[PDB]
Design an enzyme around this catalytic site. Structure first.
Site, PDB file in Angstrom:
ATOM      1  N   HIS A   1      69.403  15.450  -1.436  1.00 10.27           N
ATOM      2  CA  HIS A   1      68.434  14.640  -2.162  1.00 10.27           C
ATOM      3  C   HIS A   1      68.320  15.097  -3.612  1.00 10.27           C
ATOM      4  CE1 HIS A   1      66.865  12.463   1.426  1.00 10.27           C
ATOM      5  NE2 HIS A   1      67.488  13.470   2.009  1.00 10.27           N
TER       6      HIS A   1
ATOM      7  N   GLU B   1      70.773  17.047   4.018  1.00 11.53           N
ATOM      8  CA  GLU B   1      70.280  18.383   3.718  1.00 11.53           C
ATOM      9  C   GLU B   1      68.919  18.663   4.330  1.00 11.53           C
TER      10      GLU B   1
ATOM     11  N   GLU C   1      84.361  13.285  15.964  1.00 12.09           N
ATOM     12  CA  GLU C   1      84.673  12.198  16.880  1.00 12.09           C
ATOM     13  C   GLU C   1      85.672  11.220  16.278  1.00 12.09           C
ATOM     14  OE1 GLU C   1      81.461  10.059  18.740  1.00 12.09           O
ATOM     15  OE2 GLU C   1      82.298   8.133  18.099  1.00 12.09           O
TER      16      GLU C   1
END
Length: 249
Positions: free
Chosen positions: A77, A151, A180
């Site tokens: 951010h 974060e 994945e």
């Protein structure tokens, strides 16, 4: 604003009262700038912004899309991330992301509308048609990029990690999706470069171990290194580190 002081205290490694006043002032001014820009962003020339703004080492992402792997863009951010998304919409195209479903519902709808007006596909963390992680996995197997603010995640499903020497929890999404799907997991950082916007893509993380904790920890190390480089632009006014919190999960 008090918790912001406590967080920059961790970022710089000094007690809250010893955090430089110039850094606090620059951080409040940057946070205000983020909101000031978020207000007028849907009305700006996105073609101009896409043509005049640059992203450092953007080619890592291109090469990952040239390989057909997909890409997870995980950033903290910092700076203005909606401007970075606008940039990606103009230089590549729409990508998919998830948004926490805020209350009231009218407010969540407001944020969805806002980010959709930038060209993003926003997937509801709850109440959607499909589980978000599986739509994201589908975007990744189609060799497309997804962007996740990675974060902060202080829920029971967060990965506990060291962050500036103290215990925090970060979301597991980026690592689980890079494993994945085999997509490249790129740390990303945005900051304010004067009256402009600075953006950077960093080398993709090593997902060989398959360990979600080790991967999210290396992602945290990169985010902390970048925040330490642009400490005033990380506008995390919510509690970040566990100690400033109370109660369990």
């Amino acid at each position: 604003p008090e918790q912001l002081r406590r967080n920059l205290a961790r970022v710089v490694g000094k007690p809250p009262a010893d955090v430089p006043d110039d850094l606090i002032r620059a951080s409040l001014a940057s946070y205000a700038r983020y909101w000031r820009e978020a207000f007028r962003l849907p009305a700006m020339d996105h073609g101009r912004l896409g043509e005049q703004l640059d992203v450092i080492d953007i080619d890592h992402l291109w090469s990952a899309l040239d390989a057909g792997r997909g890409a997870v863009l995980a950033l903290p951010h910092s700076g203005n991330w909606d401007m970075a998304g606008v940039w990606l919409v103009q230089n590549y195209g729409p990508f998919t992301t998830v948004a926490e479903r805020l209350k009231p519902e009218s407010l969540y709808r407001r944020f969805v509308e806002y980010r959709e007006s930038l060209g993003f596909e926003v997937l509801p963390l709850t109440g959607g048609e499909r589980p978000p992680f599986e739509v994201l996995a589908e975007r990744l197997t189609d060799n497309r990029p997804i962007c996740l603010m990675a974060e902060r995640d202080l829920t029971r499903s967060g990965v506990q990690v060291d962050f500036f020497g103290e215990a925090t929890r970060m979301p597991a999404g980026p690592a689980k999706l890079a494993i994945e799907t085999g997509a490249a997991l790129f740390p990303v950082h945005c900051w304010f470069e004067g009256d402009g916007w600075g953006m950077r893509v960093y080398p993709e993380l090593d997902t060989s171990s398959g360990d979600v904790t080790a991967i999210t920890q290396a992602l945290a190390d990169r985010f902390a290194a970048n925040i330490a480089t642009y400490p005033a632009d990380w506008h995390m006014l919510q509690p970040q580190w566990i100690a400033d919190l109370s109660d369990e999960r």
